[PDB]
Amino acid sequence: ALLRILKETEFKKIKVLGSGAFGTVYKGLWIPEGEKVKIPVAIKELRPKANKEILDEAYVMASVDNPHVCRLLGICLTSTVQLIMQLMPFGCLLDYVREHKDNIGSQYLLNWCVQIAKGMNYLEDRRLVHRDLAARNVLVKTPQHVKITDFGRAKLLGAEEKEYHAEGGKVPIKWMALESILHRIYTHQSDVWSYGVTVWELMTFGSKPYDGIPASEISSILEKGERLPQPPICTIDVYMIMRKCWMIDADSRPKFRELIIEFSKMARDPQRYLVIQGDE
Numbered sequence: 001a002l003l004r005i006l007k008e009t010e011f012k013k014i015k016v017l018g019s020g021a022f023g024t025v026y027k028g029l030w031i032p033e034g035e036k037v038k039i040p041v042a043i044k045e046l047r048p049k050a051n052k053e054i055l056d057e058a059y060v061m062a063s064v065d066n067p068h069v070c071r072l073l074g075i076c077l078t079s080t081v082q083l084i085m086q087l088m089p090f091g092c093l094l095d096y097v098r099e100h101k102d103n104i105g106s107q108y109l110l111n112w113c114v115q116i117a118k119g120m121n122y123l124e125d126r127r128l129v130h131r132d133l134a135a136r137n138v139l140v141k142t143p144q145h146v147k148i149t150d151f152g153r154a155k156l157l158g159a160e161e162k163e164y165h166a167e168g169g170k171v172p173i174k175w176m177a178l179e180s181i182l183h184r185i186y187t188h189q190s191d192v193w194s195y196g197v198t199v200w201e202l203m204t205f206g207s208k209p210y211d212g213i214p215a216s217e218i219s220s221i222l223e224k225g226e227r228l229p230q231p232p233i234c235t236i237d238v239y240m241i242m243r244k245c246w247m248i249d250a251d252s253r254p255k256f257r258e259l260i261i262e263f264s265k266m267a268r269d270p271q272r273y274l275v276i277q278g279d280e
């Protein structure tokens with residue numbers, strides 16, 4: 001995987017898919033010059049650094065090549081930065097499980113858990129701390145295949161950095177590990193905490209964590225030992241994996257490699273681990 005530099009004439013925006021503080025995502029078509037091939041893509045236009053700095057960040061970004069992480073295919077630099085990326089036709093996994101909650105079985109849910117863990121393990125191997133893992137930031141290529149993406153919070157650790165020490169940026173409190181809330185510290189193991197919350201979202205078909213509770217009260221609730229409740233469909237074996245992800249000692253938590261193994265085992269006999277009516 002290498003970085004392509006695109007001219008505006010190469011791609012076109014078809015429609016908005018969503019937006020936020022990061023910018024706007026469009027469904028689009030990319031036609032590389034003279035290649036006569038039309039590629040469906042997602043165009044992320046961000047809301048300045050030197051062009052060479054931006055291209056260097058895009059270079060490392062384009063080298064991320066894994067079945068469960070969304071890839072950067074090209075970049076266009078004009079008055080705005082436009083990142084051309086793989087299109088995930090079914091949108092964010094959060095909305096998907098909410099829409100299809102009545103028709104999703106244990107096999108799909110556990111497979112998604114495996115896939116997200118595989119993508120995160122790949123990021124860890126690349127020394128990337130994601131810092132924003134949540135069901136809204138996992139996207140659906142097909143019902144059977146999901147991919148993680150990033151909207152700016154991910155950070156690359158230096159050779160001798162074991163943690164990222166954050167500054168004043170806005171934080172997704174309800175997905176964060178306690179040490180991140182209290183001390184602005186982020187590691188692969190705080191990503192594991194967020195993975196646990198993401199799995200809880202999936203198993204509750206996209207329910208809201210700490211629903212109706214002010215973000216400002218979350219650290220105190222966590223310090224008292226309280227955690228998100230066991231989802232109705234979860235056998236205790238699955239819930240205990242979540243609970244391990246939310247242990248106060250980051251080194252107590254499973255690593256993504258461990259999570260791949262455990263969820264893969266469960267995925268072999270899915271109805272033994274998630275209890276879903278009509279499944280199957």
Ligand SMILES: *CCC(=O)N[C@@H]1CN(c2nc(Nc3cn(C)nc3OC)c3ncn(C(C)C)c3n2)C[C@H]1F
Nearest residue numbers: 017018019025042070085087088089091092136149
């Ligand atoms: C629940 C989170 C959410 O809605 N986030 C929006 C959507 N988004 C995004 N969407 C798609 N594809 C998509 C979404 N919908 C409704 N239809 C489609 O495609 C037909 C993406 N494909 C790729 N990416 C990123 C890698 C850029 C997508 N991002 C992010 C946010 F705007």
